[PDB]
């Protein structure tokens, strides 16, 4: 059940780096179909005659390449920067915001030039020291879910752990965290898990680990001394959401009881979608229950790209207030970092 690609592309230059060489050896030994591509942003010949087929096959394709854009993007409100270790995901979350993100690809990409990437992270750390600089590693990917294949996140964790002013964070929907339990994190990595109501997970989150898997993973991670956090997102106003989310937090407190939760964090993100979401999501997930009715929403305009639909102010406040009551009830002295 850990992700293993059924098709793999390599950039030729990728073989010049340890990880690229190691992955080429791994997959050729596994007898998996391997191909060459000039650029990891330009992958041709993924199988499928329909768009739906090409999309689903892309989600089973791994692309191994070199990160050439060594400017890191901002990753607010989570962190100062997105550290680029991977992009894309094997999951099929109906609502996934990566589906309509500019220039995102459906296939999973891993970058092999870690020396370059971490060196650049250090330069960013230096530029702001002694202020703390936080890096998000799961900004455009499920970095944790992919990591059993590469150990890139484990290396980033140990890199950041050796710094004085750097911090690392990431959020996952996957339970496959065993290889990370002995990482020398040094208290500088926040290990988060995406949680939601039974309704949302059951209807919209196929291809991911279950709620119990995520919580089992959370207990391991915490027991290994990682700082622990949860991302309650997408907060979705389905029929019976009030009770649904009440039961989430009740079940969450029960599955974590005994443990010290004095440094536990929460992040709250309401369901958002873009103007092209309807056409894209319907083509890929035609049986979905996902409500993309724009008329009931408030549009937030884009800045340099296009904007997004969020719930109307009064609906969003209602969601925020309710979630904050639940977190106060079941997790007193846990910090809500933001609602957006």
Ligand X SMILES: C[Se@@+](CC[C@H](N)C(=O)O)C[C@H]1O[C@@H](n2cnc3c(N)ncnc32)[C@H](O)[C@@H]1O
Chain residues in the site for ligand X (CB under 6 A): 89, 95-98, 138, 142, 171-173, 194, 231, 233-234, 269, 271-273
Beta partners for 93? none
Interface pick for ligand SF4 out of 5, 20, 91, 166 (rule CB under 6 A) = 91
Burial class of residue 234 in the structure, from the number of CB atoms within 10 Å of its CB (0-12 exposed, 13-18 middle, 19+ buried): buried
| Subset of residues 95 to 124 that bind ligand SF4, contact rule: CB under 6 A | 96, 98
Q: Residue 139 annotated as binding?
A: no
Q: Residue 93 annotated as binding?
A: yes
Measured distance CA(191)–CA(172) in Å, rounded: 8
Nearer of residues 20 and 91 to ligand SF4, judged by Cβ: 91
Yes or no: say if 221 and 181 are a contact pair by the CB < 8 Å rule: yes
| Angle CA 314–308–50, to nearest 5 | 130
Q: Say which entry of ligand X, ligand SF4, none residue 136 contacts (CB below 5 to 8 A, set by partner kind).
A: none
Interaction between residue 153 and ligand SF4 (CB under 6 A): no
Measured distance CA(110)–CA(86) in Å, rounded: 4
Q: How many residues does the chain have?
A: 340
Yes or no: say if 192 and 229 are a contact pair by the CB < 8 Å rule: yes
Q: What are phi and psi of 146, to 5 degrees?
A: -85, -25
Interaction between residue 75 and ligand SF4 (CB under 6 A): no
Binding mask 212-241 for ligand SF4 (x = CB under 6 A): ------------------------------
Measured distance CA(72)–CA(113) in Å, rounded: 14
In whole angstroms, how close is the CB of 120 to ligand X at the nearest point? 21
Interface pick for ligand SF4 out of 46, 58, 83, 89 (rule CB under 6 A) = 89
In whole angstroms, how close is the CB of 95 to ligand X at the nearest point? 4
Annotated binding site for [4Fe-4S] cluster: 89, 93, 96
């Amino acid at each position: 059940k850990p992700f293993v690609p059924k098709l793999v592309y390599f950039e030729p230059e990728a073989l010049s780096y340890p990880l690229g060489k190691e992955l080429y050896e791994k997959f050729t030994q596994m007898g998996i179909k391997i191909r060459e591509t000039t650029s990891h942003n330009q992958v041709r010949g993924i199988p499928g005659e329909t768009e739906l087929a090409r999309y689903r096959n892309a989600k089973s394709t791994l692309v191994v390449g070199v990160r050439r854009t060594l400017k890191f993007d901002s990753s607010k409100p989570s962190a100062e920067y997105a550290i680029p270790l991977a992009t894309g995901c094997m999951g099929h979350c109906h609502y996934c915001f990566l589906q309509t993100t500019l220039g995102s690809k459906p296939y999973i990409r891993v970058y092999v030039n870690l020396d370059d990437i971490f060196a650049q992270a250090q330069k960013y750390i230096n530029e702001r020291a002694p202020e703390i600089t936080r890096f998000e590693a799961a900004c455009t990917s499920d970095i944790v879910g992919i990591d059993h294949l590469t150990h890139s996140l484990k290396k980033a964790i140990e890199f950041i752990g050796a710094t004085d002013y750097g911090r690392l964070r990431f959020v996952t929907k996957y339970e496959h965290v065993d290889h990370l339990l002995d990482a020398r994190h040094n208290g500088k990595t926040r290990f988060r898990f995406s949680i939601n109501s039974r309704y949302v997970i059951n209807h919209f989150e196929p291809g991911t680990s279950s709620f119990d898997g995520r919580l089992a993973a959370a207990r391991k991670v915490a027991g290994a001394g990682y700082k622990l956090g949860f991302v309650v997102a997408p907060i979705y106003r389905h029929e019976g959401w009030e009770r649904g989310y009440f039961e989430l937090f009740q079940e969450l407190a029960r599955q974590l009881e005994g443990m010290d939760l004095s440094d536990l964090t929460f992040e709250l993100i309401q369901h958002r979608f873009t103007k092209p979401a309807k056409r894209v999501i319907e083509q890929r997930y035609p049986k979905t229950r996902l409500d993309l009715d724009e008329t009931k929403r408030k549009y937030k305009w884009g800045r340099y790209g296009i904007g997004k639909y969020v719930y109307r102010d009064e609906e969003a406040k209602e969601l925020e207030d309710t979630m904050r009551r639940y977190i106060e009830q079941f997790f007193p002295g846990a910090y809500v970092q933001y609602f957006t």
